[PDB]
């Protein structure tokens, strides 16, 4: 079975903090709460680094919910033809699920099905088969802990496995798990999709998670994304799931994410101004 | 001085051919000619590969003009803190210029100012200064051969040096050469620009070259690019320069370029259909009285 989802608006941690130190965690949770988000999305690329007790304390202090996203790396790539590397991926994904479970969360999303970043060539049948089997194992592990997994479709420079919602849905057909969902991100859609509606309408109840990012990943409404068409499509399918505002500036750097995402430019410096305008922007389109 | 530019529409070689063998050169030049393009843009990532005499004969046979684009690689990266790698870059750029000159061409464009692809971190002041100095030396070499150079602004995953038109213009001011121009590409703009007009309007006469690519680099008008604003901008600055249709499908693969551009998807397989529809699309928006 799937676990409950609700329409709720979140902020990604990199809007506020490049780390999850006591100070970094507080800055991000306080920032999301101040802006009036329902949840913070924690970037769990190293799930062993996060102090669960400290994080639970901060979420209670600020009356805030948490979901988690991550990308794997070459060392943890579940697409790998090296079985030791796939096993390191399974291990990281189980640890991320355990952290989310300890925080009382219900959603593990993002690039959980491969290494986030540049592949040297196209995926083989083996790469894909390895990824599908890894997401079956992860879905089954998460199901015991009341957690849905949401497979984020990202652009060609960030994966060779799935670059469109339609490809994502075909992948999910092969996974065939009730608690495995599609995750769409307007920034990635802006590059790869034939308009901003087709993949949402095709996905229907299988769309489990949404990222809102401008074309340049900066202030919403200052770039090229057709948000009107995207939000109309969400209304058509009566979408009732997480919507995270996601934005990257050289102002706030995570050394293990920011260089992978090639965030060379400062698109903003005022985290509170950006987040506050992002939430208002999203609520207006709902 | 700058060298003459004209409003002309071209097709990128990779629409037809992944190499420049006799058969490959003919397929691309015949293809560009059959679609009704004014010129072919030859990908010179390895300028020592080109049979110049064969290519000159083909361009004459089909009454077609040629421009050239390229990207450097790690071994030829003019941003490098290794002077030996910068020297290899200078040498490749000179050879590309020599090929274009022999073919009677006037435009060397694309990612001529760094290695095309993913950088592991942001560019240092030294990376940028090395690139600027290299583009000055290239501009001066090209100027003796009647050639303009056009620095192609590309997205964050393909360079760390310049990702917007506005960044391109500041870099170009540091180069300070009259035959050096900004080169904008709607595919890259779709990621990095605040709308499709700002950089064009800011560039004015400094815009020397244009690439037309859909958001996904497939059929024009099947993606997300606001071409209406882009072409409105070109009209407002009375743009008079090359406009190349550029498209990448796994159907046609240059091993030197296709994997760097992460072309994982086949968005087309009929070169003539893609190129014919692209020319129609571009012509309509150039004459579009709006
Ligand atoms: O869109 C992206 C990456 O481009 C993020 O959503 C990614 O999944 C990362 O894991 C965030 O933590
Ligand atoms: O836009 C691009 C690369 O994404 C091409 O135009 C590139 O500059 C190269 O010069 C092609 O040969
Ligand atoms: Mn995202
Ligand atoms: Mn281009």
Author numbering:
A (entry chain A): 1 to 286
B (entry chain B): 1 to 290
Paper passage:
The monomeric structure of MetLRE is similar to that of homotetrameric l‐ribulose 3‐epimerases, but the short C‐terminal α‐helix of MetLRE is unique and different from those of known l‐ribulose 3 epimerases. The length of the C‐terminal α‐helix was thought to be involved in tetramerization and increasing stability; however, the addition of residues to MetLRE at the C terminus did not lead to tetramer formation.
Here, we report the isolation of a novel protein from Methylomonas sp. expected to be a putative enzyme based on sequence similarity to ketose 3‐epimerase. The synthesized gene encoding the deduced ketose 3‐epimerase was expressed as a recombinant enzyme in Escherichia coli, and it exhibited the highest enzymatic activity toward l‐ribulose, followed by d‐ribulose and d‐allulose. The X‐ray structure analysis of l‐ribulose 3‐epimerase from Methylomonas sp. (MetLRE) revealed a homodimeric enzyme, the first reported structure of dimeric l‐ribulose 3‐epimerase.
